[PDB]
Amino acid sequence: SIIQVFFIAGRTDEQKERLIGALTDAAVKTIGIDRSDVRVILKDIPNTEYGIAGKTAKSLGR
Amino acid sequence: SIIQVFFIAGRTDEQKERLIGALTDAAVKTIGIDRSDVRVILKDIPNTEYGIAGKTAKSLG
Amino acid sequence: SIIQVFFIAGRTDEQKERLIGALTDAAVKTIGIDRSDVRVILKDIPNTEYGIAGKTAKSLGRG
Amino acid sequence: PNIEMFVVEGLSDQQKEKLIDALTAATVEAIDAPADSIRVWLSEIPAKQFGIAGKSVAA
Amino acid sequence: PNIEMFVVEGLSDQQKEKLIDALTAATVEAIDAPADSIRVWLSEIPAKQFGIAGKSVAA
Amino acid sequence: PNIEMFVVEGLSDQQKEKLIDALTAATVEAIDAPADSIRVWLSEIPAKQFGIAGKSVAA
Lengths: 62, 61, 63, 59, 59, 59
Description:
The complex is a heterohexamer, with three copies of chain A and three copies of chain D (59 residues). Chain A is 29% helix and 31% strand. Chain A has 62 residues and is of the alpha+beta class. Chain A has a single domain, classed as Macrophage Migration Inhibitory Factor, CATH 3.30.429. Chain D has 59 residues and is of the alpha+beta class. Chain D has a domain at 2-41: Macrophage Migration Inhibitory Factor. Helices cover 32% and strands 32% of the residues of chain D. Chain D has one helix at residues 13-31, and strands spanning 2-8, 39-45, 50-52, 55-56. The radius of gyration of chain D is 14 Å and the shape is elongated. The chains are: A alpha+beta (62), D alpha+beta (59). At the A-E interface, strand 1 and helix 1 of A face strand 1 and helix 1 of E. Strand 3 of chain A pairs antiparallel with strand 2 (39-45) of chain F. Chain A: This is 4-oxalocrotonate tautomerase family enzyme.
């Protein structure tokens, strides 16, 4: 019923709404719940605050 | 309006039930958000997976 | 102050004890916070419930 | 007893800090927990990042 | 990217596999994100701990 | 492994870097996870929205 997305910042506003609908429709497709109780929370994390292998996303080209 | 409480395992099922609507009403009051949309997720964490000052909730309490 | 770890199940509780300590130890060494304000939430996720590349962790041979 | 509230953006500074004591007293009250043990932090999600039935709050 | 989906406890391991796939596929094609970069975890909540409008799912 | 740390505002991009590095190293030597397998993100909270005992980090 609640989908939380953690992801690096920089995606278009229209990519963000394309995701919200795409993930809702995954749950409603696969589990068969009603889109009404689906909540999609998108957490933009800045590239200075997201790390992979101990390195900020920024130093990684991200 | 989604609420998620991280709390040590052991609380009674009535206490859990008591916690959901308690948090729900408090949000409806102060923010004016309809009960319709206040979701309350309760997560038990075993004592061996909860940390206070780098110590486990088992060895502390 | 609150650290939350999402990690595949299978580790010993003795290991989760080191993890809680080492993480808190790291967060007071670096940004000068008090130990007593740091909470570590450890959230194990079973093989069947964790996914990479659309495959479950069990099918990748992880837990 | 730690609590995280996901709230769509646009709340007052007065009513956010107001939300914190409310949510804290609710746990003290229900589960008999000491005040100095409950931490409440509000996560402020933009209207284009909060989805309801596949739609954004913006829409 | 990273997805944490909160679900109530009434799903089988096969449904759960089919859901990690579905969610992974949705991110791949709403956003042009590569699949092998998408980590999906299901946080299964007992029905007595999942609240909708002051009421547990169990109620 | 995946790590979310909730931090109050006021931290340097440079202090944020060494924290990611420190949170990562501690996870390597504790659960023997390779460092390139650990994803870290800091989810930063304004002092006015992070509450301790019903009152924000502003007092």
